[PDB]
Tab-separated table of C-alpha atoms and ligand atoms in Angstrom:
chain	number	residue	atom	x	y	z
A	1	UNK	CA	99.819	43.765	101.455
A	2	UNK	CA	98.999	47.218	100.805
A	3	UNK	CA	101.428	48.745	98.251
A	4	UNK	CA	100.691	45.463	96.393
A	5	UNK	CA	102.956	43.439	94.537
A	6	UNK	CA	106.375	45.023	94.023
A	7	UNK	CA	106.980	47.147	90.567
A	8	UNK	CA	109.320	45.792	88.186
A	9	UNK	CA	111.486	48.320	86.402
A	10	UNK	CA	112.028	48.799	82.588
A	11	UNK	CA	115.090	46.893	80.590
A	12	UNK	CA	113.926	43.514	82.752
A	13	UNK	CA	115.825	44.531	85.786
A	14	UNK	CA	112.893	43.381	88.035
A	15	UNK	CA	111.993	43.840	91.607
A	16	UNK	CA	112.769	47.472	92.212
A	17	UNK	CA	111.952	46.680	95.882
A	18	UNK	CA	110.843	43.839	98.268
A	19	UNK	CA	108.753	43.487	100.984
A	20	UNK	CA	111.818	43.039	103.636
A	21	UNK	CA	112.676	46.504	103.027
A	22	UNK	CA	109.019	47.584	104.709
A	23	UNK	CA	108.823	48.090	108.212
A	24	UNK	CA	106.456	46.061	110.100
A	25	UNK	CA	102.928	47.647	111.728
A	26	UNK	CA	100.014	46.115	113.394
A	27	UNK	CA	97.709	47.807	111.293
A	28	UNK	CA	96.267	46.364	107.682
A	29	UNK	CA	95.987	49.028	104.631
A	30	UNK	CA	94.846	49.093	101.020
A	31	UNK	CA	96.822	50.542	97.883
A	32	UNK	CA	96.518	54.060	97.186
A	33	UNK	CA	95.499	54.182	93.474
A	34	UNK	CA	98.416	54.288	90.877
A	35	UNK	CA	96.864	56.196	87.856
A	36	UNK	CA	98.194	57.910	84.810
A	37	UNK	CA	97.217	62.121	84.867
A	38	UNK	CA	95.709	61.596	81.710
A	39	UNK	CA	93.223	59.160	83.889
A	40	UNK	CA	89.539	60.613	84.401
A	41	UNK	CA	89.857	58.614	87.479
A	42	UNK	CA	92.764	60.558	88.530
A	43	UNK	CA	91.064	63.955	88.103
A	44	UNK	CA	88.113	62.275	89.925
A	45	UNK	CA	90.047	61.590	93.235
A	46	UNK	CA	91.833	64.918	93.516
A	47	UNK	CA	88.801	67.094	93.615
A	48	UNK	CA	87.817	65.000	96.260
A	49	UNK	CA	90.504	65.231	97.990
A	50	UNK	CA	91.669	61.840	98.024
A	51	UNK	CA	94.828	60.532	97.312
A	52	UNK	CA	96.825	59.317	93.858
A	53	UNK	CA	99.808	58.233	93.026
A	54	UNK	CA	100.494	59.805	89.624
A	55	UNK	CA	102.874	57.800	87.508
A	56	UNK	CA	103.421	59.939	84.243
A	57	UNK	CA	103.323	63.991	84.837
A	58	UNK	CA	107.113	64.721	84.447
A	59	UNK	CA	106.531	66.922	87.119
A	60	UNK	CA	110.059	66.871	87.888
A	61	UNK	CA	111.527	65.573	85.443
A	62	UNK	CA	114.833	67.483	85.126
A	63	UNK	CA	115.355	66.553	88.715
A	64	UNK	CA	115.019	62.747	87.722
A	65	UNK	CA	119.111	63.177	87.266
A	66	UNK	CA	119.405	64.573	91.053
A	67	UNK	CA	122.243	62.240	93.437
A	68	UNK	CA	124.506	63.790	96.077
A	69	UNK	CA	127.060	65.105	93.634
A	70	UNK	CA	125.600	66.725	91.228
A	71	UNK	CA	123.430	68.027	92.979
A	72	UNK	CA	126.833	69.321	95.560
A	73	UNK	CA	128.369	70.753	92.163
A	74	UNK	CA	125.344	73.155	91.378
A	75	UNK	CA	122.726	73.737	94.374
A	76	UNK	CA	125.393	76.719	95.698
A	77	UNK	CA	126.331	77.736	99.029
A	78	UNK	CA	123.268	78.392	101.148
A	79	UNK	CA	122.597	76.684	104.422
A	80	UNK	CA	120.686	73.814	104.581
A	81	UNK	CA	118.608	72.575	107.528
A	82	UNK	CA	119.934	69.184	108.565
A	83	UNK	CA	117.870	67.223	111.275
A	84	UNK	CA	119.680	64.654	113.293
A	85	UNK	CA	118.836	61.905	115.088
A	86	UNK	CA	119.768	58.699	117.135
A	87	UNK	CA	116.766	56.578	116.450
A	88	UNK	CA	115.372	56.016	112.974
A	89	UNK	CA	112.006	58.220	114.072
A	90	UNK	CA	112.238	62.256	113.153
A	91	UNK	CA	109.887	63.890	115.218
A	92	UNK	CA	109.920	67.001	114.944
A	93	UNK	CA	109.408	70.482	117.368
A	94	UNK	CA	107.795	73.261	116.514
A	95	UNK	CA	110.960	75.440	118.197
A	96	UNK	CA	108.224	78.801	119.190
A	97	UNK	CA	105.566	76.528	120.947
A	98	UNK	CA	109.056	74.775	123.169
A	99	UNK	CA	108.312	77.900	125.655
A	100	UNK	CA	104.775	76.448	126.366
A	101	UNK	CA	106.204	72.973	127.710
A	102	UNK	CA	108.943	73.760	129.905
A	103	UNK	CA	109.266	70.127	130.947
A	104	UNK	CA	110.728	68.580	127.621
A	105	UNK	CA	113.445	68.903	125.803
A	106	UNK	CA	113.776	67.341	122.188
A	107	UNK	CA	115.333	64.597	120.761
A	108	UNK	CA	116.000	65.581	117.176
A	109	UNK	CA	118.564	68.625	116.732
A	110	UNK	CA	118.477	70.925	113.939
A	111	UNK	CA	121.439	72.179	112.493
A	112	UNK	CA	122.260	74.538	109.685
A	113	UNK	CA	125.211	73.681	107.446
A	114	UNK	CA	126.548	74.216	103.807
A	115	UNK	CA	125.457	71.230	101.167
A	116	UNK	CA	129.030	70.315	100.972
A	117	UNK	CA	129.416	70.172	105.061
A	118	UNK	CA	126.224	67.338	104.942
A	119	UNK	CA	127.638	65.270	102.222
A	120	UNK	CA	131.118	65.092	104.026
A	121	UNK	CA	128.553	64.477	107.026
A	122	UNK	CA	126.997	61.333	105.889
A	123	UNK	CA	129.901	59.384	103.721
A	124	UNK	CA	131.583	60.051	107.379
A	125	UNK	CA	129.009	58.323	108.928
A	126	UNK	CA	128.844	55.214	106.537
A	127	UNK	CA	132.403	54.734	107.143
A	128	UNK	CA	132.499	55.536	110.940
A	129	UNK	CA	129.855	52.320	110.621
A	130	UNK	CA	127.464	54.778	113.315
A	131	UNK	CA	123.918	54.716	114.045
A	132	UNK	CA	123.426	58.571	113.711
A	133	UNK	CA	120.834	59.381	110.767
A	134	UNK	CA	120.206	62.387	109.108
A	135	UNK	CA	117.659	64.092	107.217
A	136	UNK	CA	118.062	67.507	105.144
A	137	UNK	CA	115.122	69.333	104.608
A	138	UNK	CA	115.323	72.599	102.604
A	139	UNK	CA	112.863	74.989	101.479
A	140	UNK	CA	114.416	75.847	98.104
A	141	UNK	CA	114.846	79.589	97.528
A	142	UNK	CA	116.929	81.431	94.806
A	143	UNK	CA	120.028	81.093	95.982
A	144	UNK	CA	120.458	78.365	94.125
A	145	UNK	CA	123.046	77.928	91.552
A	146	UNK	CA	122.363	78.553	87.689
A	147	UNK	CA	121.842	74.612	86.628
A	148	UNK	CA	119.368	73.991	89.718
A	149	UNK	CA	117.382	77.279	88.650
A	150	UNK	CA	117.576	75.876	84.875
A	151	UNK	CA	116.193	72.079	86.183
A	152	UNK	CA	113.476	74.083	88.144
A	153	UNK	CA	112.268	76.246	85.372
A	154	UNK	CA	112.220	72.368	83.618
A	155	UNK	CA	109.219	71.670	85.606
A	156	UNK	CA	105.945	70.666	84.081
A	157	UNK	CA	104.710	74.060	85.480
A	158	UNK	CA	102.233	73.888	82.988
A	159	UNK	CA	100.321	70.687	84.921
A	160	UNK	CA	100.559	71.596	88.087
A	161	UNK	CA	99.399	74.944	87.880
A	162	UNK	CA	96.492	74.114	85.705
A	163	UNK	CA	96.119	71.472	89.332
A	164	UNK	CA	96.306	74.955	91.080
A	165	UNK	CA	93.930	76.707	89.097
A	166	UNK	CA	90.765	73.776	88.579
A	167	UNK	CA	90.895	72.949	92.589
A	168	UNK	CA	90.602	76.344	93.492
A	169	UNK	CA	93.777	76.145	95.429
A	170	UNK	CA	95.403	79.436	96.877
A	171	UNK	CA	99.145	80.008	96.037
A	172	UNK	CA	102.124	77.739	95.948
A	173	UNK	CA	103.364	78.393	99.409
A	174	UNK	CA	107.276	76.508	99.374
A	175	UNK	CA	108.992	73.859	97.392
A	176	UNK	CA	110.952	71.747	100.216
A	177	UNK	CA	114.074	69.580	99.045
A	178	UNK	CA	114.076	66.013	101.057
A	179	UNK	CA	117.025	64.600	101.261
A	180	UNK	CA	117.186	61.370	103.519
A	181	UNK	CA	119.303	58.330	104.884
A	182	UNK	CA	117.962	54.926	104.231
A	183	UNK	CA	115.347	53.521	106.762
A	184	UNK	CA	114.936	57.247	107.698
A	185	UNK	CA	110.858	57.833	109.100
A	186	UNK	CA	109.101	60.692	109.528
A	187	UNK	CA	106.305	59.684	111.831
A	188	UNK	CA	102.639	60.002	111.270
A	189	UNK	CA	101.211	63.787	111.178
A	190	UNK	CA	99.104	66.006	109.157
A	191	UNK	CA	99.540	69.398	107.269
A	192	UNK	CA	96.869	72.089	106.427
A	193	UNK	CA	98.024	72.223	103.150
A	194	UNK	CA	97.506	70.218	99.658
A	195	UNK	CA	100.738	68.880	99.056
A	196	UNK	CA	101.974	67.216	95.806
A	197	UNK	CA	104.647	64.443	96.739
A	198	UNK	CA	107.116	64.312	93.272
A	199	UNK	CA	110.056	61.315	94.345
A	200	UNK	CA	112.602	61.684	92.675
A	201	UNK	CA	115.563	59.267	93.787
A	202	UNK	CA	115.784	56.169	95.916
A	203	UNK	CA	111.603	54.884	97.052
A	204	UNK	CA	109.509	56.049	100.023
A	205	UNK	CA	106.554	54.092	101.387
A	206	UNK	CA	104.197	55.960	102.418
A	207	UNK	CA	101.440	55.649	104.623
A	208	UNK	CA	97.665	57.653	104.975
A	209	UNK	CA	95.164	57.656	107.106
A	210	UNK	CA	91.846	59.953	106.165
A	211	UNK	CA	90.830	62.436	108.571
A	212	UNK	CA	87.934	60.522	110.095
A	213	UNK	CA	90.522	58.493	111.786
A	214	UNK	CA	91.650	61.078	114.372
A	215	UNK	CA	89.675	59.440	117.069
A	216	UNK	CA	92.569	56.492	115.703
A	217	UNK	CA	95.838	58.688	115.771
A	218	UNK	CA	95.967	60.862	118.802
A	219	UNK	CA	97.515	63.866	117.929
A	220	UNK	CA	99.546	66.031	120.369
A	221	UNK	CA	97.751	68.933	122.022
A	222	UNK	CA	97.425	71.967	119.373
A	223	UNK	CA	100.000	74.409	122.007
A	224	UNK	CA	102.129	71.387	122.341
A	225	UNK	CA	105.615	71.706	120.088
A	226	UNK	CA	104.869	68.085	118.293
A	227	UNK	CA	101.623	69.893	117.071
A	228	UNK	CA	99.708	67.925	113.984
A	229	UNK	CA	101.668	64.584	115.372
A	230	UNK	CA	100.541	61.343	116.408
A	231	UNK	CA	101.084	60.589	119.683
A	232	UNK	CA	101.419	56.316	119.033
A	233	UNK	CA	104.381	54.618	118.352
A	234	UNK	CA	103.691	52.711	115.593
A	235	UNK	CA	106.501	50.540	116.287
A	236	UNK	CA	105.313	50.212	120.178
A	237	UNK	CA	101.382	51.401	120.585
A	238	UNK	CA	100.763	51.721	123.479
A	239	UNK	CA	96.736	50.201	123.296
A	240	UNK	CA	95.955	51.371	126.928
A	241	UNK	CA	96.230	54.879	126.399
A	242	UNK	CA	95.787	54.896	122.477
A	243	UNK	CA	93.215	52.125	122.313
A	244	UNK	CA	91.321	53.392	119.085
A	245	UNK	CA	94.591	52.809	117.145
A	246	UNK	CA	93.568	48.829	117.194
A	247	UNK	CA	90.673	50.001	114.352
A	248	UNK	CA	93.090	52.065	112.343
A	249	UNK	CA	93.705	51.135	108.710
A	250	UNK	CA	95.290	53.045	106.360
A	251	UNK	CA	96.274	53.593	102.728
A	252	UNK	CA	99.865	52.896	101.654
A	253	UNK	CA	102.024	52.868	98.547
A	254	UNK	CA	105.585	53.045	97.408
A	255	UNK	CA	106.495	55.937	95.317
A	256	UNK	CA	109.651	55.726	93.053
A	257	UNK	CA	111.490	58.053	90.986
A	258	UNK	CA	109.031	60.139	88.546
A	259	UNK	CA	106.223	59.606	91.020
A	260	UNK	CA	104.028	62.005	92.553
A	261	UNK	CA	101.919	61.023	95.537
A	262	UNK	CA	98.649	63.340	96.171
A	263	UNK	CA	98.779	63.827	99.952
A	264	UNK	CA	95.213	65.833	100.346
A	265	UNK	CA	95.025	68.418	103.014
A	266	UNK	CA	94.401	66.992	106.826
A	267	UNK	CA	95.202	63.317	105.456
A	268	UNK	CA	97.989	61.727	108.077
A	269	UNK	CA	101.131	60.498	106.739
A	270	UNK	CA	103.339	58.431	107.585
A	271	UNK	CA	107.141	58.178	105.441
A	272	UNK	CA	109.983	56.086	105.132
A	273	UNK	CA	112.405	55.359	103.542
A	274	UNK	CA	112.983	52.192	102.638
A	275	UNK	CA	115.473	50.070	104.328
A	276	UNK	CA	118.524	49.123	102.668
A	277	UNK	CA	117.347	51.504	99.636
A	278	UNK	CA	120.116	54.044	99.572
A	279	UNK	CA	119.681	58.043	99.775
A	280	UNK	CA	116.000	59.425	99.137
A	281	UNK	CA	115.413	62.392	97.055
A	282	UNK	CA	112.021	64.213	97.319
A	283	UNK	CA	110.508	68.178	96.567
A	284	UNK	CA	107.267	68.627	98.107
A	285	UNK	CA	104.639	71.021	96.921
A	286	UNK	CA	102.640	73.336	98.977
A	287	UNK	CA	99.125	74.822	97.975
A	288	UNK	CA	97.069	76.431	100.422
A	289	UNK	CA	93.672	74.965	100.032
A	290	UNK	CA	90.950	76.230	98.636
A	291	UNK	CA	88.656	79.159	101.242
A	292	UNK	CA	86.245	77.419	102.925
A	293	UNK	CA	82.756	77.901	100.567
A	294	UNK	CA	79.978	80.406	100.966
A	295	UNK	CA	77.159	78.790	102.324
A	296	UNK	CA	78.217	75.550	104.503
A	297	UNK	CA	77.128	72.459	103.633
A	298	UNK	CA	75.729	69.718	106.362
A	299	UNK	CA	77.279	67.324	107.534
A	300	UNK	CA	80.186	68.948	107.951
A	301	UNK	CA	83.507	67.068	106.189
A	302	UNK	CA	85.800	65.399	108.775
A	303	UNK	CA	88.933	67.631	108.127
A	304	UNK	CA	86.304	70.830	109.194
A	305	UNK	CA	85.598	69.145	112.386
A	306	UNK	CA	89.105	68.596	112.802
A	307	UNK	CA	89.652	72.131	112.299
A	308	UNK	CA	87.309	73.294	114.306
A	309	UNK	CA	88.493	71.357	117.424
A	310	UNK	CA	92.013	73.045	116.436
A	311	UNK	CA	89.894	76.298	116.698
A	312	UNK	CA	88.380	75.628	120.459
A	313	UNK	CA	92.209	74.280	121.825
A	314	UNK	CA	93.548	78.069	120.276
A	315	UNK	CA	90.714	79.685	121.600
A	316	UNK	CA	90.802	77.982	125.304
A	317	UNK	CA	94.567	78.020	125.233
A	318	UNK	CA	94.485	82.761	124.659
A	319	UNK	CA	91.043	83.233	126.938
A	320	UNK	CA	92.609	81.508	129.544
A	321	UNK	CA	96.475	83.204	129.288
A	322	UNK	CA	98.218	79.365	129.439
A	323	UNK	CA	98.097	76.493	127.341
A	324	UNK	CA	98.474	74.443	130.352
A	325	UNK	CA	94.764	75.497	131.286
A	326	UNK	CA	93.193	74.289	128.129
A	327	UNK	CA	93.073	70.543	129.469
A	328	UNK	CA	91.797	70.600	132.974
A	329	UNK	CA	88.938	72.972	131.628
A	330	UNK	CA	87.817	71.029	128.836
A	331	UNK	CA	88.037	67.882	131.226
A	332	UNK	CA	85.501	70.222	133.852
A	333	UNK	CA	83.201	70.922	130.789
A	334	UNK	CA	82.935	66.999	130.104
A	335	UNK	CA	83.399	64.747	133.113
A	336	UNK	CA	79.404	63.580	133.735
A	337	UNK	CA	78.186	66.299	131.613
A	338	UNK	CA	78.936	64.592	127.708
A	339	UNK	CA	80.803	61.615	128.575
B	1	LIG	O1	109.637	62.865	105.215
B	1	LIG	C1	108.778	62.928	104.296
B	1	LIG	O2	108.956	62.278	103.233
B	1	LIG	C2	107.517	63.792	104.478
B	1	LIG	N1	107.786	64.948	105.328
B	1	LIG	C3	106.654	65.738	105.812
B	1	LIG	O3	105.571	65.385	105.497
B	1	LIG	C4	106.895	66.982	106.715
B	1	LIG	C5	105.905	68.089	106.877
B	1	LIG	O4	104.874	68.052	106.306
B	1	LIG	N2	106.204	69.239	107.757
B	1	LIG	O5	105.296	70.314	107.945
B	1	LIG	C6	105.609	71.371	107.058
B	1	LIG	C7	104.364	72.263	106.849
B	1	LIG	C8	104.356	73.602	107.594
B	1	LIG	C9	104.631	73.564	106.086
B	1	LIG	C10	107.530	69.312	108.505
B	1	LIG	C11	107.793	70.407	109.332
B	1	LIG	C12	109.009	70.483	110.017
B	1	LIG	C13	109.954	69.453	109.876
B	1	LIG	C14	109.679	68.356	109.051
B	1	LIG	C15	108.469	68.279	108.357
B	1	LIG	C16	108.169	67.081	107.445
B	1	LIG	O6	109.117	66.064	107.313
B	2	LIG	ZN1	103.689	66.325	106.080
């Protein structure tokens, strides 16, 4: 049991979730802190780059009111990426590295469509009774109608940028819209950037794993379009070729509306929505992290040794002219030389 006991909601309307609505994993976890920003505790963990579920910033709290039609009435008439896909996995393809790996083609299409066009999208799909999921994810821009702008400028910009400003962070990079179907995952992967998680309708379990678990998690090759990815199935691991994944253990929680999850940069995550929950409503927040210090201290964190071997597979992969290369040479530098 990591998110722990399930949260009951004001007005006695009690279990806001159950445990059926998880999915089941072969791997155990502990609960990611839930703290209060006003929390010394809370301060404590970000600076260290762990993570916290804040409870109480208001972050977005004009968005709190966010569901398919309002938000249909007012967000205007840009395009919105919509990913689709038969299973209830999302992986994702970086589209520029697809040249790289000839031999596959993906299995979660992109398509871009008005806001309108994916709500007529999904009710049709409900009713249709089909297995087809979708998930539209949005970097919000300002073409955005005058009550979205208004519930944006509602922010607590005032808390988060003060965030920005004591961790050292570099700019706020993009402010991605989530909008997903029920039982909707997004697989286990990592980002280079800090990343403030503010739910905002329906819940979202999510599960972390600290960069020291690499050796755990597999990712794809750096060249390879499912770059930053695990390569297990969590719902099938495959212990033969993935065999450190039987020592992984993570840190999970469920966030609900007015939460904000702390994903630090280089933690995995893994999301999903919860089954039988409804709709999920999410905006993510992107800081570049902080430039890496003057003099380097020793031992080295995990997430710069991750970054360094990210380094050497970008390195090998341009000295050599192919990707492709970048395995059978590092192989030749290791077989019954360092293993
Ligand atoms: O689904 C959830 O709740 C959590 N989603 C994520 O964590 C997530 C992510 O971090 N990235 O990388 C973006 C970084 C480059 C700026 C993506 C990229 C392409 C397509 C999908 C995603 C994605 O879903
Ligand atoms: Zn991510």
């Amino acid at each position: 049991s990591g998110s722990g006991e399930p949260r009951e909601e004001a007005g006695a309307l009690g279990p806001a979730w159950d445990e059926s609505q998880l999915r089941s994993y072969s791997f155990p976890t502990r609960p990611i802190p839930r703290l209060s920003q006003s929390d010394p505790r809370a301060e404590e963990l970000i600076e260290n780059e762990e993570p916290v579920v804040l409870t109480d910033t208001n972050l977005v709290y004009p968005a709190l009111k966010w569901d398919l039609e309002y938000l249909q009435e007012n967000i205007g008439n840009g395009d919105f990426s919509v990913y689709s896909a038969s299973t209830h996995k999302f992986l994702y393809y970086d589209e520029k590295k697809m040249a790289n790996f000839q031999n596959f083609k993906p299995r979660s299409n992109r398509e871009e469509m008005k806001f309108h066009e994916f709500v007529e999208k999904l009710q049709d799909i409900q009713q249709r009774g089909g297995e087809e999921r979708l998930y539209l994810q949005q970097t919000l821009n300002d073409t955005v109608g005058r009550k979205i702008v208004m519930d944006f400028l509602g922010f607590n910009w005032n808390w988060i940028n003060k965030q920005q400003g004591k961790r050292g962070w570099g700019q706020l990079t993009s402010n991605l819209l989530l909008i997903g179907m029920e039982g909707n995952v997004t697989p286990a992967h990592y980002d280079e950037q800090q990343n403030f998680f503010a739910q905002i309708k329906g819940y979202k379990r999510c599960i972390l794993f600290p960069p020291d678990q690499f050796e755990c998690l597999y990712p794809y090759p750096v060249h390879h379009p499912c770059d930053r990815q695990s390569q297990v199935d969590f719902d099938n691991p495959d212990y033969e070729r993935f065999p450190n994944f039987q020592n992984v253990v993570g840190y999970e929680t469920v966030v609900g509306p007015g939460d904000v999850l702390y994903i630090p940069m280089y933690w995995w995550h893994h999301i999903e929505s919860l089954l039988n929950g409804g709709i999920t409503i999410t905006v993510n927040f992107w800081y570049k992290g902080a430039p890496t210090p003057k003099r380097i201290e020793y031992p080295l964190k995990a997430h710069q040794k991750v970054a360094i071997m990210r380094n050497i597979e970008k390195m090998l992969g341009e000295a050599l002219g192919n990707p492709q290369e970048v395995g059978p040479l590092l192989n030749t530098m290791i077989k019954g030389r360092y293993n």
